[PDB]
Design a protein around this ligand. Structure first.
Ligand code: AGS
Ligand code: AGS
Ligand code: AGS
Ligand code: AGS
Ligand code: ADP
Ligand code: ADP
Lengths: 548, 562, 605
């Protein structure tokens, strides 16, 4: 009572009701009060993620004390918190010893409470502990406890671990609707259970950084305040919260709705916006992804295991680069592993990395280490027909059971990824001998487990226009830093085709071909003159090359 | 006035009786006294692993001094419990801790030789530096302060032995843990304090059960406190159960309740109902395994033997190897067992021995020796059994692993031991090892029993229990296999309200299709999928099938129809 | 009422009407009042960097407060500050008691509380003062990011700098105040040029005050040059005056070796004297027919800042860059494909076309040894900085260990090597314009690649202290010799299987040098002999080599497995050996020229 400047009270202000009723989490209080009444290894410590309700539990304990529900062994005691940030090189221990003296002079069982004790731990308080005068209650997280309370601890023999995992959705919903009338008078508009459950599920779904009991309340109170500030609609609602979540993340409030039909029905041209032609292919792949996400197939299998073959450079990779954007929300999600190194017997274990203590161990495997983190990729396999006939064992093990075991000992799961097996077979075969070749080259019962084996059709010599038009409308962005406009002339743009297609490399050069030509040919004018940001820069076909 | 703000008075604390009654440990106290009464270098240090009672010896000497049961030249010495945390606490300056330590030393030596000191966990005396914890040596090797100490073996080795010139001034008294009998004696001494703290009663049968179970199942801690803790927990637990809820003493089954609540192990004395479950086991397990009557009996008898109290308490709870034809149901029996006695079909630890064709890949389940790349990670198998020490270990198809991995199981079995890279040990004493294979595959019991003897060696075949030979799928009962599959399918189709109406001809044909005697029931799940689930996935996304439809199937001449 | 002395006021200054120009940031003000009208985690803190305009944000907040645009809980709220120009712990009770007795109507604004955080924390846990904060992000993360004891009452509010179209309005709202001291005119041309030019180029400070300091320094520079003789009329005059005194002290030199230094210092004087006259004559033209700020002094102050060149078209730099591919062919021979590529990416930066958030160029060339993959980078660094010493060259062969990543990043605080700073970061933090050479990238530990993966497409990286140095105006070069025997597929596969494809992704064109041939070797023999002459011109012993001699040389050392180094070895062994045999045996003393000629096998001097 003489040095009460680096610590607060919990039972005094509980005579005022300055604390929230603590509905939920009625088991942890029994656990704590049971550990607090032993003879040794008493004075527990709460262990859990930040923002889950550890302080909430200790406050509820204080409130049950002031009410009177505990055994008389614990009856008639106060609780005091400790702020570690109020002290901090040195003199931290001076104030700490001045505090411990007061605690000992308390001459009773006046229980303390220390939040984030792993800032203290040490050998200064253990004699205070192993004598029977203080009782501390703590708080930290699991990995912290494993660090500051496990390596140099030697005190783990007097701290009891109590776990506070995290609430469920249907439980934090009750928590919220219990903590509702408060804000209904603080701001005061109106509250709908629809808004509450919407906040809960949307935070759970898209806010993957924080945790539930406060993560939800954050959005609820911020949205209520935004609605109050609006009055410079007299109700709150689910859209009234999706707008907040969108202003929080960046993704628009439209897509923040149904994710099954509103996705399967988008498998239309929204793919064909980035991919071109091959409409049979896109429709087939869309069937594959739709009927697989229905919810009747075996739950332990990839979400798609189709392959496609034919000519090069027509967009074989581009279909996957676009598909990763629509489903997993990124084009930096695919992983491509060439089956050209894997032409020997031994190198098949390079994509796992076998033993602890050999050359490639901490480097992990090529196929697994890129999956156990971010398990939502889109795996490609260039020129699979060249891989040694031993990789197929690992591959069949994948697509027959959604699991695999790396070198470390971890278990990885492939039950929500998409396999893709490209190939350059089909040199002359149109549709007749190409399938005979791919039925005789690969194992016959392997292809029994695949999905559709669709064959890309060549670029229609007219349907080079759409791809080059996408390329050109893209490069229309290039010189927007100067706002210079571009000229198009269908003879010139078609003159790129017959001299840049090169159907041995698909359509690969048509990016450098045009960017180097236009950019570094204008690089004289763009420095001297001849152009400004209203000039379409008329470029045309000289009888030989592409002058202006 | 220096050793009053940096120390307590342990002998005065013993006078007020605030200490627990040290019981036994007479050789150690006699050695400590005969070391503490020397002429020069009278400094004993109690060394021993954590929890074995190293401070209790010093409190015992304190109580003995108070009672006057010490030799001639040791009466009224008033030992003192020094501490350094309250000295190195406030000082950020040059020469500030040294004046404190020098005042303390001067006050100890200005009094006559009657201030026996006591620094506990003295491995925290090597620091204090920034030439500190080092002023103490000239007074140490001259018999001026006694300095009874107590540290752990590991901490001693790590901190003190790097300073050999100070280890010379210490005599190591080795404190070894007591056996179960001395632990029972200690508990008999200490029962009263707990009986008074918690307003309950404690029974000697419960004490014996604590000291015994605390030694067969908790194989990481040490005895005199590992045993006391069970008593304390059960007493507090019973007190809570008596209160707060509007024959009242701890019994020899509450301790089993605790030691089974944590560690998971079902150690106990067969509470009622569990016995009914165990008796009704051969059939309750048959609901997921059709046939193989000769094999389920062995496993069931093994489990019953283990829990009835008649089984060698230091050897695995079963080491069967069952082998036979292909797709007969071996792995499936294993999974059915694991689901039976754990309620989680993945609560087992299966390793796929088809991957160890190369010699070196053994290190995955051992770990790597000191000084190599993956060292502090440990071994897969060792770490997977060190926690959850009650699982069912499974070795799928141990016939590809070339004959150098066998020689690790050769001592896994028959003792339940295994050592990782760090030199620890795991206890397999209460798992069930199961290892399948495929040798033979169709032949008589003497055309497979010879291939076994030509593949494995006597030292290994001689380790395990019965070598079960699985039968063939009787062409009459496959309707029940199909029924099991359809039960699984219907359970999967319950997020909606769908049901199935499979006709007898449909079921009969489904069994008749895809059960070739060369592959057994292997190509059946895939067939059911491709012939029902695909057809219905095309039929659910395109309307005309909505939740509630008891979808009927039919047996059209060609492949099945809906 | 006892804080009227220890703190200023903004409830009365706003009624009187004096406040700095606040335009924009109205959404920020709305965010601040919105977070103030909450129950928990209210009372925000502003996060940014010095000179973004959060001071202006709170000032506009105060003006809007006195005007009235508020909710009900904001009855003018009499927001005040707590003057950090008022600084002991016995007075702070007297300061805090006034706010404590109030009902939350005198809320404070702790400008730069980053150092304030005992006394304010318990008085915050009861919830009586708002204590509006404003700091920077790194100091925030250091001080009050890890302490969750106080992070339950602080909601960080991010702010950005650029408001270009209103930055010009701010310049206007300040243009009046900068024309008073400097007797100059600050034109809208200058406003809009500085608002538009120093933004991407001078990327060390931030627009809302760097666009201010540019105009301030331009004003001061112009006011200085208004004095009779301006810049570049005060420069060649100070040069020619000094040059003369260097000539009048060399005539009285009884030396023959300094005559050639007297015979040149005279000439450069004769060359600089004219350009003095030409400017002086043209001066009177403008004297009878600069007195105002424009767009040229802007680029002037840009160039004089951070060494970065950023002008309209700098009238001495025009024909150099179109001559680059040819100007570079004086030092590097062959690899037309490589010189075209390395060249087409310097203009696209001096033109303003290239991507503004990526290095001004970053790509790799590799191939056999002794081809020029290092002489090319050296030649590049020689004609941009005019001295080859001005290239940052780090070797990746010493970084073969994992824990050597902290060698070029620095070691964390509290360790031994801490004040020494980094090795790569500490060179690009101060004066970033150089070219950084990564010698033998293959020999490095495949973990430093994860740092260049950051530098690519982000343009910065962090060090041991936590700050971020910028990498947006340099060129990054990679050298290696993977394969070294394969045509094009072995080396392609080797680099593809040695580096991540998402590291080769952000790279520009990947270059493969060919190797030298007989036709390109005579041009190298000439460079070698010219450099050798320039070297032994310190004893005035010029050489005289014949065409059969140069052909004998260029034929002798050619073998297409080691490149060109055998040529230097042969030059030394065949000429310098004999020459140094004679030079200390007399008979070839200073001031001499010895001819060489082909003999049947050797070439006698
Ligand atoms: N059962 C509950 N009853 C009432 N409020 C609860 C409950 N569980 C969580 N909360 C609230 O959730 C928020 C989380 O606050 P805290 O309990 O302090 O978080 P924490 O888990 O203790 O970790 P810290 O201390 O925030 S780092 C507070 O507003 C609590 O009041
Ligand atoms: N011989 C004994 N007689 C009575 N009680 C004992 C005896 N041995 C151990 N105990 C009790 O068992 C526990 C042993 O704890 P301590 O010996 O005090 O700790 P420790 O043995 O020093 O281990 P550390 O390393 O200090 S944590 C205490 O509760 C003792 O009272
Ligand atoms: N008696 C049985 N009761 C139920 N399902 C069975 C039975 N026998 C086989 N099966 C089914 O057969 C399928 C595969 O059987 P498995 O036991 O996995 O084959 P196996 O015993 O592992 O033999 P191999 O050599 O490993 S293929 C599973 O779907 C089981 O459900
Ligand atoms: N095309 C060239 N232009 C200019 N100097 C050249 C050329 N080819 C060779 N040289 C000279 O020959 C030597 C080769 O220098 P480097 O460029 O370091 O060799 P390199 O091509 O880098 O081979 P490595 O892999 O670095 S050993 C230097 O003395 C160069 O001056
Ligand atoms: N249908 C298409 N839609 C869009 N771009 C396409 C299409 N077909 C080919 N392309 C373009 O052709 C080029 C080749 O892409 P890709 O197939 O990934 O090449 P590679 O086979 O060399 O890896 C890319 O620039 C890609 O955008
Ligand atoms: N939007 C604005 N436009 C023009 N001048 C401004 C604007 N906001 C503030 N100012 C003035 O210019 C100064 C720029 O520095 P300031 O914004 O105070 O930085 P800080 O407070 O972060 O140190 C302000 O102090 C103010 O006098």
């Amino acid at each position: 009572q003489a040095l009460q400047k680096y610590s607060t009270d919990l039972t005094a202000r509980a005579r005022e009701g300055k604390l929230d009723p603590v509905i939920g989490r009625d088991n942890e209080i029994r656990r704590v009060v049971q550990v607090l009444s032993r003879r040794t290894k008493n004075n527990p410590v709460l262990i859990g993620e930040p923002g889950v309700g550890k302080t909430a539990i200790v406050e509820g304990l204080a409130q049950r004390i002031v009410a009177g529900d505990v055994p008389e062994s614990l009856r008639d005691k106060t609780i005091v918190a400790l702020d570690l940030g109020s002290m901090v090189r040195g003199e931290f221990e001076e104030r700490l010893k001045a505090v411990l003296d007061d605690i000992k002079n308390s001459a009773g069982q006046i229980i303390t409470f220390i939040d984030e004790l792993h800032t203290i731990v040490g050998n200064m308080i253990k004699p205070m502990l192993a004598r029977g005068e203080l009782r501390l209650v703590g708080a930290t997280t699991l990995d912290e406890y494993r660090k500051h309370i496990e390596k140099d601890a030697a005190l783990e023999r007097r701290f009891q671990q109590v776990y506070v995992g995290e609430p469920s959705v249907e439980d934090t919903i009750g928590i919220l609707r219990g903590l509702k009338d408060r804000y209904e008078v603080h701001h005061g508009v109106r509250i709908t259970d629809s808004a509450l459950v919407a906040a809960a599920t949307l935070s759970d779904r898209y806010i993957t950084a924080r945790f539930l009991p406060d993560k939800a309340i954050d959005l609820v109170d911020e949205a209520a305040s935004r609605l109050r500030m609006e009055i410079d609609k007299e109700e709150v609602g689910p859209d009234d919260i999706a707008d907040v979540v969108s202003a929080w993340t960046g993704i628009p409030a439209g897509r923040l709705l149904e994710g099954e039909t509103a996705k399967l029905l988008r498998m239309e041209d929204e793919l064909g916006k980035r991919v071109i032609g091959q409409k049979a292919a896109v429709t087939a792949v869309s069937d594959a992804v739709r009927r697989s996400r229905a919810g009747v197939s075996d739950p332990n299998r990839p979400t798609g295991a189709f392959m496609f073959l034919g000519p090069t450079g027509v967009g074989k990779t581009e279909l996957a680069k676009a598909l990763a954007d629509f489903l997993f929300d990124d084009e930096r999600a695919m992983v491509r592993i060439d089956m050209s190194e894997y032409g020997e017997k031994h190198t098949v274990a390079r994509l796992i990395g076998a033993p602890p203590g050999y050359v490639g161990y901490e480097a992990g495997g090529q196929l697994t280490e890129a999956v156990r983190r971010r398990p939502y990729t889109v795996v490609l396999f260039d020129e699979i027909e060249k891989a040694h006939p031993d990789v197929f064992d690992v591959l069949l093990q994948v697509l027959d059971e959604g699991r695999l075991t790396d070198g470390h000992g971890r278990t990885v799961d492939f039950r929500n990824t998409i396999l893709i097996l490209t190939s350059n077979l089909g040199s002359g075969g149109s549709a007749e001998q190409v399938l005979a070749a791919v039925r005789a080259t690969f194992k016959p019962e392997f292809i029994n487990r695949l999905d559709d084996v669709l064959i890309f059709e060549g670029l229609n010599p007219e349907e080079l226009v759409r791809i080059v038009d996408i390329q050109l409308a893209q490069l229309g962005k290039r010189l927007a830093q100067r706002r210079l406009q571009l000229q198009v002339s269908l003879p010139a743009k078609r003159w790129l085709a017959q001299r840049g297609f090169d159907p041995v490399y698909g359509a690969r050069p048509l990016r450098r071909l045009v960017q180097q030509a236009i950019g570094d040919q204008l690089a004289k004018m763009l420095l001297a003159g001849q152009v400004h940001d209203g000039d379409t820069v008329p470029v045309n076909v000289s009888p030989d090359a592409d002058s202006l």
